[PDB]
Design a protein around this ligand. Sequence first.
Ligand SMILES: O=C1N[C@H](c2c(CNCc3ccc4ccn(Cc5ccccc5)c4c3)[nH]c3ccccc23)c2cc(O)ccc21
Ligand SMILES: Nc1nc2c(ncn2[C@@H]2O[C@H](COP(=O)(O)OP(=O)(O)CP(=O)(O)O)[C@@H](O)[C@H]2O)c(=O)[nH]1
Ligand SMILES: [Mg+2]
Length: 166
Amino acid sequence: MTEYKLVVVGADGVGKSALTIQLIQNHFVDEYDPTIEDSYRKQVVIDGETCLLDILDTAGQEEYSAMRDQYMRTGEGFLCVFAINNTKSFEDIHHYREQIKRVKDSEDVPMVLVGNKCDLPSRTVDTKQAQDLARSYGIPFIETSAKTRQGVDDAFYTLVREIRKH
Ligand SMILES: O=C1N[C@H](c2c(CNCc3ccc4ccn(Cc5ccccc5)c4c3)[nH]c3ccccc23)c2cc(O)ccc21
Ligand SMILES: Nc1nc2c(ncn2[C@@H]2O[C@H](COP(=O)(O)OP(=O)(O)CP(=O)(O)O)[C@@H](O)[C@H]2O)c(=O)[nH]1
Ligand SMILES: [Mg+2]
């Protein structure tokens, strides 16, 4: 039995809350309720190990950006979420990744690049663009949908596997 402190980060509206609520409660939140800070818990078996996921759902709003330092210091692994219909959110990954590396004084932080909202009929951020970014960071890239559950379990489980490896 091992606890893993996971942090879900990204721009305001990429679907951080919807991804976490889908993982835990098995349902899609269609509403847009801006987050200040919430934490969720999930006990799952990953590679025969009982994993106690302590998931922090953070604010995309810059209004609460001062809270970032303490949670980045405490967090073991990070899901860096952008939406596939939002180029700006994809560009923001660099700024989130830079802050995490600086605060933790480490370039080798367990991290997973998450391209959310892949259920959408149209896309602005190409799969190859995101694969190339993940390859440049040396981290895994997983396409997800908080609506259909596409890649949601793989995103969180892969992050746990990155923490264990580190
Ligand atoms: O040291 C910290 N731990 C916070 C934390 C959690 C919460 N652990 C589970 C837990 C236990 C005891 C209570 C008592 C009340 N709550 C509700 C609660 C919800 C959200 C935020 C705080 C409290 C609790 C929730 N998971 C993380 C995953 C990655 C990084 C940091 C955390 C946290 C948040 C923060 O911004 C700064 C520093 C820390
Ligand atoms: N079609 C689709 N919509 C999604 C998906 N994930 C989230 N959404 C939608 O996007 C909107 C924002 O989702 P939300 O989870 O609140 O984003 P957030 O990043 O937590 C917003 P904040 O940073 O302010 O907390 C909601 O209307 C939600 O239904 C998805 O995978 N597919
Ligand atoms: Mg939210």
